[PDB]
Every structure is written in C-alpha cells, then in structure tokens.
C-alpha cells in the first residue's frame, strides 16, 4: 500500500460542502490518496484508490 496521508478536513482546515477534501488544503487529495484513516467530515475526495 502507498503512504497514506491523513487529514482533519472539517474538524480543522476548511469545512465545506463538496470541496472539503477536494481542495488543495487536503494532503490526501494533493498527494493522490484516499481518506483512509482520516478525521475528515464531509469528505468528498475524488481520489478513490485505484484498485482494479
Ligand atoms: Zn481532507
Ligand atoms: Zn484525508
Ligand atoms: Zn477526506
């Protein structure tokens, strides 16, 4: 498994509707990772782990 960044988008950072984890203040998003193990609230992260 790749290095998984963790974020608290919602608890801190920037609470939003869609752009919570989808903005560049989210380390996961920026580093091409899903929010596995995060404390993000209202996480819309388009980086869903590519598992084919
Ligand atoms: Zn986030
Ligand atoms: Zn995250
Ligand atoms: Zn998230």
The experimental method behind these coordinates is: NMR
Centre of ligand 3 to C-alpha 52, Å, is: 21
Centre of ligand 3 to C-alpha 33, Å, is: 9
- From residue 6, how far is each of 39, 52 by CA, in Å? 8, 23
24 is in an annotated binding site: no
Centre of ligand 2 to C-alpha 45, Å, is: 8
- From residue 17, how far is each of 10, 36, 40, 47, 52 by CA, in Å? 9, 19, 12, 17, 29
Q: Collapse the DSSP code of 30 into the 3-class scheme (helix H, G, I; strand E, B; otherwise coil) and give the result.
A: helix
- In this structure, the number of other CB atoms found within 10 A of the CB of residue 23 comes to 15
Q: Which residues contact 22 (CB under 8 A, 6 or more apart)?
A: 16, 29, 44, 45, 46
Eight-class DSSP state of 3: -
38 is in an annotated binding site: yes
> Token match 């560049």: residue?
24
């Amino acid at each position: 498994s790749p290095p998984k960044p963790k974020c608290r988008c919602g608890i801190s950072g920037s609470s939003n509707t869609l752009t919570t984890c989808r903005n560049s203040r989210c380390p996961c998003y920026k580093s091409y990772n899903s929010c596995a193990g995060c404390h993000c609230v209202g996480c819309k992260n388009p980086h869903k782990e590519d598992y084919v």
